[PDB]
Amino acid sequence: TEGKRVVVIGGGLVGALNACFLAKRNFQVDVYEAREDIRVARSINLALSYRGRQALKAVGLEDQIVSKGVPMKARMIHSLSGKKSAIPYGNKSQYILSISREKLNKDLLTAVESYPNAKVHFGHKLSKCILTMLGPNKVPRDITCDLIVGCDGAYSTVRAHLMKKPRFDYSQQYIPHGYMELTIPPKNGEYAMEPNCLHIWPRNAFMMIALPNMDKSFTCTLFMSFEEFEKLPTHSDVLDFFQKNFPDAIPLMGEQALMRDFFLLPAQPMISVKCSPFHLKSRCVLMGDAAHAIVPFFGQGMNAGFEDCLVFDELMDKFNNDLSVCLPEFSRFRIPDDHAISDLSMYNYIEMRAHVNSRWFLFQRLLDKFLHALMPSTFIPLYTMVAFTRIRYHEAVLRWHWQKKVINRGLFVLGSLVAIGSAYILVH
Amino acid sequence: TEGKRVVVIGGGLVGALNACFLAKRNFQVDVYEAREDIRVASINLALSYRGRQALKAVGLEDQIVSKGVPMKARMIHSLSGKKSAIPYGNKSQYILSISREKLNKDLLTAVESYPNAKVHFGHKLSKCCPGILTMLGPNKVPRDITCDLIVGCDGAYSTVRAHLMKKPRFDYSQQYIPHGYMELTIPPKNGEYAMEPNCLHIWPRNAFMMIALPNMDKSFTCTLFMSFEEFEKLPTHSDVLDFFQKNFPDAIPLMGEQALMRDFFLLPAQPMISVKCSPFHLKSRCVLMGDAAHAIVPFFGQGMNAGFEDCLVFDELMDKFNNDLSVCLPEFSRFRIPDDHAISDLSMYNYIEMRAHVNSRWFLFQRLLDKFLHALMPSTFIPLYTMVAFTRIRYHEAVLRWHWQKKVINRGLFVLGSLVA
Numbered sequence: 001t002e003g004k005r006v007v008v009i010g011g012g013l014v015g016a017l018n019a020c021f022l023a024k025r026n027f028q029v030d031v032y033e034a035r036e037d038i039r040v041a042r043s044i045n046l047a048l049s050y051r052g053r054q055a056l057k058a059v060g061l062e063d064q065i066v067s068k069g070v071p072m073k074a075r076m077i078h079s080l081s082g083k084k085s086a087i088p089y090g091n092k093s094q095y096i097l098s099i100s101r102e103k104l105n106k107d108l109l110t111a112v113e114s115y116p117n118a119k120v121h122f123g124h125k126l127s128k129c130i131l132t133m134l135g136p137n138k139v140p141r142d143i144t145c146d147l148i149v150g151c152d153g154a155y156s157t158v159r160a161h162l163m164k165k166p167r168f169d170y171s172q173q174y175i176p177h178g179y180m181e182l183t184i185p186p187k188n189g190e191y192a193m194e195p196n197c198l199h200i201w202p203r204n205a206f207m208m209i210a211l212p213n214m215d216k217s218f219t220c221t222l223f224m225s226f227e228e229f230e231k232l233p234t235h236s237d238v239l240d241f242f243q244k245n246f247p248d249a250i251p252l253m254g255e256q257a258l259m260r261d262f263f264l265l266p267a268q269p270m271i272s273v274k275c276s277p278f279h280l281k282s283r284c285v286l287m288g289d290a291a292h293a294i295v296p297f298f299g300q301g302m303n304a305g306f307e308d309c310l311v312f313d314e315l316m317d318k319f320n321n322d323l324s325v326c327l328p329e330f331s332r333f334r335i336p337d338d339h340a341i342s343d344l345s346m347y348n349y350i351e352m353r354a355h356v357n358s359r360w361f362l363f364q365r366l367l368d369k370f371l372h373a374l375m376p377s378t379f380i381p382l383y384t385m386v387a388f389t390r391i392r393y394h395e396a397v398l399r400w401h402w403q404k405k406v407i408n409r410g411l412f413v414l415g416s417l418v419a420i421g422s423a424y425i426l427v428h
Numbered sequence: 429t430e431g432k433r434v435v436v437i438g439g440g441l442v443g444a445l446n447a448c449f450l451a452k453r454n455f456q457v458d459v460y461e462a463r464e465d466i467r468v469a470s471i472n473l474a475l476s477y478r479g480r481q482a483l484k485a486v487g488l489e490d491q492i493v494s495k496g497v498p499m500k501a502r503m504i505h506s507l508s509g510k511k512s513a514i515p516y517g518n519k520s521q522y523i524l525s526i527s528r529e530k531l532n533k534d535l536l537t538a539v540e541s542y543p544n545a546k547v548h549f550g551h552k553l554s555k556c557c558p559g560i561l562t563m564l565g566p567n568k569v570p571r572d573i574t575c576d577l578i579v580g581c582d583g584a585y586s587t588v589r590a591h592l593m594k595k596p597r598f599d600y601s602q603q604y605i606p607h608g609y610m611e612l613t614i615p616p617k618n619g620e621y622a623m624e625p626n627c628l629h630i631w632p633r634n635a636f637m638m639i640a641l642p643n644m645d646k647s648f649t650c651t652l653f654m655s656f657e658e659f660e661k662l663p664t665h666s667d668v669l670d671f672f673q674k675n676f677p678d679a680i681p682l683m684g685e686q687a688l689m690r691d692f693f694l695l696p697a698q699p700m701i702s703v704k705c706s707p708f709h710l711k712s713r714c715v716l717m718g719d720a721a722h723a724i725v726p727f728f729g730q731g732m733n734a735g736f737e738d739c740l741v742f743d744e745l746m747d748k749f750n751n752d753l754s755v756c757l758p759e760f761s762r763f764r765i766p767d768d769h770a771i772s773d774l775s776m777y778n779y780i781e782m783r784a785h786v787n788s789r790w791f792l793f794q795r796l797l798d799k800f801l802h803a804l805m806p807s808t809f810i811p812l813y814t815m816v817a818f819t820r821i822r823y824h825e826a827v828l829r830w831h832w833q834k835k836v837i838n839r840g841l842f843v844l845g846s847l848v849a
């Protein structure tokens with residue numbers, strides 16, 4: 001019905017979105033957010049794709065977010081040699097777009113407040129032992145409800161309770177790599193690079209990507225194993241490194257501001273958490289990074305959490321607001337998918353260490369483009385499937401494996417027919 | 429050295445043993461056991477080389493080995509009623525059935541045999557720090573206590589570990605497997621053992637499995653593994669009987685025809701939990717051992733044995749490096765984690781293998797095949813189970829050698845097979 005009450009832990013990206021979706025069903029939705037309100041007081045800007053956008057669309061916020069974003073119509077690949085090679089995101093109608101973390105969060109907290117049947121209680125934490133604190137600490141004044149939604153991010157308190165509950169599978173892995181942000185400013189008030197591209201500098205042990213902001217700049221994030229981060233404790237090491245591996249960056253970024261920004265704070269650890277199931281007896285449910293913290297190697301963390309919100313809302317339609325049905329159906333329907341994108345993201349991260357240089361990224365993608373054009377749509381590349389559709393993640397993995405099977409089997413018969421065809425036309 | 433104090437959290441198998449090892453180098457060791465003294469207030473399990481070697485190091489091999497029953501072979505009960513004995517490797521090589529409780533008691537007694545050791549029954553732990561908060565005999569008596577070392581030996585659902593889990597660069601995972609387990613008893617028959625008393629008795633089915641281990645009174649304790657789903661479908665005696673008649677037919681006459689009913693409905697199927705974590709320590713002040721650090725699924729007879737080995741390998745290090753905990757704690761994690769992960773893995777592999785590829789017959793063929801090739805080459809083929817059960821070859825090295833063999837044979841017999849035919 002309308003006048004059941006729900007509390008959302010976390011006023012983050014997913015927390016705020018879910019609040020809107022719920023408010024939009026006339027729930028009494030109270031949001032509790034640890035930090036102080038960001039509109040007065042981890043990444044900087046993220047890649048927003050179809051799944052996130054479809055979820056934004058259901059609350060009528062797609063347009064507002066889309067407008068403050070910069071499109072990325074292509075990948076732009078910065079070879080070691082220096083060669084700049086571009087490859088499009090799918091067809092001409094399909095483009096991911098770069099948006100800012102903060103702008104995204106802010107418009108969302110304001111969208112929460114636009115529903116009079118929704119409030120957002122800033123400066124309220126959830127303590128380690130189910131009490132929500134007020135402004136002044138040790139003011140234990142929690143208050144009960146028909147639903148508690150954990151959107152408290154990757155280091156979720158709500159999940160920490162659920163972990164002690166029974167038949168709850170859970171896993172948390174810090175990967176060897178860490179990430180650090182570095183800005184490319186405008187060169188004479190204009191973007192220093194082609195601004196409707198995702199920029200990549202793919203090496204083997206290291207990786208840099210850069211995404212465009214509106215103020216004509218880019219924010220780059222740098223992935224390398226904490227190992228190498230150890231080996232560059234001095235400014236000469238950093239410079240030496242950038243000169244060796246990232247030749248064209250130094251002019252683009254500030255050659256001396258590079259050094260202020262690198263040593264500003266330490267390479268950030270990336271965490272992977274899986275768990276199952278996502279719910280508990282129609283009283284509690286996890287969502288987004290609280291349910292699934294993935295390594296950031298597919299541009300899907302926020303998108304998938306946004307999609308969680310949506311898939312819930314679809315089930316609330318499909319089962320007339322029965323929480324006792326929706327909560328188990330969410331776990332059943334969605335866990336397979338959220339696990340799959342987790343795996344994909346991890347795999348990508350592994351691939352990224354073994355073999356991507358300037359050259360293989362191009363071959364691998366242009367091969368995929370070759371085969372889509374060859375046999376559309378019986379081959380849709382993976383990156384298209386995740387980025388520009390709502391095909392379920394695990395189905396996308398399936399299709400992706402099957403396809404890979406028929407490319408390998410297909411290539412084999414042609415290799416063999418070459419291999420007998422050459423011999424026959426060599427003997428006679 | 430004698431100046432330093434250590435707290436062992438848990439007075440179970442690993443706690444009690446570790447407390448001995450530690451007491452035996454004059455630490456002030458205090459064991460804190462949340463249960464009451466079991467000597468005044470897996471019923472039984474499979475002891476082997478690794479555990480025995482640890483026990484030996486502390487002068488308790490003999491005592492424990494006396495109250496155990498040698499198991500010189502596996503004995504496989506096929507659905508037909510056929511009974512095939514597969515030996516353990518060699519005549520010297522045999523595993524032995526012992527009681528969890530006797531084992532625990534003798535060790536609690538050994539702990540107290542040291543004047544510099546104490547065990548504190550009815551004391552639980554709340555919270556700790558690298559200064560800890562233990563609960564008195566009376567609940568809500570949270571006195572603080574301090575030490576130079578805190579040893580998590582508090583089992584699979586470990587409090588100490590729950591603290592380490594919050595720290596940075598700490599990988600952890602728990603997974604409840606889908607089967608639970610239940611103990612049943614095969615009593616004595618006319619005062620004698622109802623089956624060959626020096627075997628590990630197996631009844632392998634696919635969804636199910638039962639094993640049985642001989643006690644000293646002339647009985648066996650069975651542990652039955654089946655999926656919680658299946659357990660759900662047997663609420664009434666008639667159903668249990670009808671099930672048993674299908675799947676384990678020679679059991680209804682072996683077991684108390686209605687002892688089965690007493691024991692089966694005594695309490696519910698127990699869950700099995702795999703937990704893995706890394707690393708096993710927190711900077712020279714806190715270490716995990718046994719199931720605090722590695723709760724493996726009970727399908728290789730090795731959980732107690734590995735955790736016993738932990739205590740020994742810690743000791744080996746404390747010897748190597750003159751009792752420096754700053755060195756021994758990192759070296760513990762560095763040396764032991766790969767091994768303890770390997771045995772966990774082996775176990776789960778086994779647990780899955782049992783769910784498809786073993787009915788009655790493959791167990792016989794796999795083992796006899798294996799034994800042909802060891803006999804053929806006594807130092808290049810040592811079978812897996814021999815390496816774990818009867819040696820201290822490191823677990824991960826045993827997995828290495830095991831895969832290696834598997835390949836040189838797959839290779840060498842795809843060669844004989846494909847080339848000459």
Ligand SMILES: Cc1cc2nc3c(=O)[nH]c(=O)nc-3n(C[C@H](O)[C@H](O)[C@H](O)COP(=O)(O)OP(=O)(O)OC[C@H]3O[C@@H](n4cnc5c(N)ncnc54)[C@H](O)[C@@H]3O)c2cc1C
Pocket residue numbers: 009010011012013014015032033034035042043045046047048052124125126127151152153154155156157179221287288289290296298299300301302303304305
């Ligand atoms: C380097 C990097 C790059 C990324 N790039 C992309 C990308 O290109 N595209 C994409 O889709 N995703 C990306 N992501 C993923 C994205 O950051 C997350 O998926 C997204 O933030 C999830 O939203 P959330 O609300 O679940 O978590 P969060 O955004 O972390 O929100 C959690 C909120 O809960 C609050 N909170 C926490 N604990 C408590 C408590 N106890 N009580 C009350 N409140 C609490 C926090 O203060 C915070 O406000 C990236 C992540 C990283 C790290």
Ligand SMILES: Cc1cc2nc3c(=O)[nH]c(=O)nc-3n(C[C@H](O)[C@H](O)[C@H](O)COP(=O)(O)OP(=O)(O)OC[C@H]3O[C@@H](n4cnc5c(N)ncnc54)[C@H](O)[C@@H]3O)c2cc1C
Pocket residue numbers: 437438439440441442443460461462463470473474475551552553554581582583584585586587609651717718719720726728729730731732733734735
């Ligand atoms: C069905 C089954 C079969 C098995 N078969 C075999 C086998 O054949 N061979 C083999 O080697 N191993 C076997 N095992 C494994 C064996 O049971 C365990 O390895 C062993 O008990 C681990 O010892 P531990 O002391 O670490 O754990 P435990 O024996 O669980 O000891 C933990 C102790 O700490 C106490 N404690 C817990 N929390 C606290 C707290 N907060 N404060 C104070 N005290 C606390 C508990 O009361 C308990 O007494 C089997 C296990 C099962 C379930």
Ligand SMILES: COc1ccc2c(c1)CN(c1nc(C(=O)N(C)c3cc(Cl)c(F)cc3C(=O)O)c(Cl)s1)C2
Pocket residue numbers: 043045046047075096198200209211221296297298299348383387
């Ligand atoms: C800090 O903000 C961040 C951090 C990481 C990412 C993003 C924003 C956005 N990124 C996206 N990745 C894909 C993708 O499908 N894959 C396989 C790729 C993966 C990597 Cl790592 C890459 F460099 C390019 C592609 C590619 O194909 O463009 C998208 Cl689609 S968007 C990753």
Ligand SMILES: COc1ccc2c(c1)CN(c1nc(C(=O)N(C)c3cc(Cl)c(F)cc3C(=O)O)c(Cl)s1)C2
Pocket residue numbers: 470472473474502523628630639641651726727728729730778813817
């Ligand atoms: C409740 O008490 C329990 C529970 C499980 C076990 C035991 C006692 C003792 N068990 C031992 N397993 C091995 C072993 O090496 N393997 C791989 C085997 C694994 C299984 Cl499941 C099996 F049935 C036989 C063998 C076998 O070969 O004997 C030993 Cl060696 S001892 C498992």
Ligand SMILES: [Cl-]
Pocket residue numbers: 294295296297298299300301302
């Ligand atoms: Cl992400």
Ligand SMILES: [Cl-]
Pocket residue numbers: 724725726727728729730731732
């Ligand atoms: Cl075990």
